[PDB]
PDB file of all heavy atoms in Angstrom:
ATOM      1  N   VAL A  51      58.766  -9.119 -68.648  1.00 22.69           N
ATOM      2  CA  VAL A  51      58.354 -10.317 -68.049  1.00 22.69           C
ATOM      3  C   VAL A  51      58.273 -10.365 -66.604  1.00 22.69           C
ATOM      4  O   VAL A  51      57.321 -10.812 -65.904  1.00 22.69           O
ATOM      5  CB  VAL A  51      59.193 -11.501 -68.630  1.00 22.69           C
ATOM      6  CG1 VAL A  51      58.980 -12.751 -67.785  1.00 22.69           C
ATOM      7  CG2 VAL A  51      58.844 -11.821 -70.031  1.00 22.69           C
ATOM      8  N   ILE A  54      55.463  -7.752 -65.322  1.00 22.42           N
ATOM      9  CA  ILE A  54      54.185  -8.261 -65.531  1.00 22.42           C
ATOM     10  C   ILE A  54      53.919  -9.357 -64.515  1.00 22.42           C
ATOM     11  O   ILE A  54      52.769  -9.581 -64.069  1.00 22.42           O
ATOM     12  CB  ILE A  54      54.021  -8.710 -66.924  1.00 22.42           C
ATOM     13  CG1 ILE A  54      54.238  -7.646 -67.895  1.00 22.42           C
ATOM     14  CG2 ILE A  54      52.614  -9.387 -67.134  1.00 22.42           C
ATOM     15  CD1 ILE A  54      54.325  -8.081 -69.399  1.00 22.42           C
TER      16      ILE A  54
ATOM     17  N   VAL B  42      56.976 -17.186 -68.917  1.00 43.62           N
ATOM     18  CA  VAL B  42      55.855 -16.527 -69.752  1.00 43.62           C
ATOM     19  C   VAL B  42      54.577 -17.442 -69.588  1.00 43.62           C
ATOM     20  O   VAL B  42      53.452 -17.039 -69.473  1.00 43.62           O
ATOM     21  CB  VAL B  42      56.164 -16.467 -71.211  1.00 43.62           C
ATOM     22  CG1 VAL B  42      54.843 -16.213 -72.001  1.00 43.62           C
ATOM     23  CG2 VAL B  42      57.137 -15.185 -71.491  1.00 43.62           C
ATOM     24  N   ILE B  45      53.213 -16.996 -66.094  1.00 41.88           N
ATOM     25  CA  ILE B  45      52.627 -15.736 -65.918  1.00 41.88           C
ATOM     26  C   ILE B  45      51.315 -15.531 -66.665  1.00 41.88           C
ATOM     27  O   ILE B  45      50.411 -14.888 -66.282  1.00 41.88           O
ATOM     28  CB  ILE B  45      53.670 -14.576 -66.379  1.00 41.88           C
ATOM     29  CG1 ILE B  45      54.760 -14.525 -65.341  1.00 41.88           C
ATOM     30  CG2 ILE B  45      52.926 -13.254 -66.466  1.00 41.88           C
ATOM     31  CD1 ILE B  45      55.887 -13.590 -65.713  1.00 41.88           C
TER      32      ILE B  45
ATOM     33  N   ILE C  45      49.634 -10.738 -72.250  1.00  2.00           N
ATOM     34  CA  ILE C  45      49.631 -11.158 -70.892  1.00  2.00           C
ATOM     35  C   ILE C  45      49.580  -9.871 -69.986  1.00  2.00           C
ATOM     36  O   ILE C  45      49.090  -9.852 -68.934  1.00  2.00           O
ATOM     37  CB  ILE C  45      50.846 -12.043 -70.651  1.00  2.00           C
ATOM     38  CG1 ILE C  45      50.744 -13.356 -71.314  1.00  2.00           C
ATOM     39  CG2 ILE C  45      50.966 -12.297 -69.122  1.00  2.00           C
ATOM     40  CD1 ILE C  45      51.965 -14.261 -71.158  1.00  2.00           C
TER      41      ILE C  45
HETATM   42 XE1   XE D   3      54.619 -12.270 -69.657  1.00  2.00          XE
END
Side-chain angles (χ1 to χ4, degrees):
Chain A
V51 163
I54 298 172
Chain B
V42 161
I45 291 174
Chain C
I45 294 173

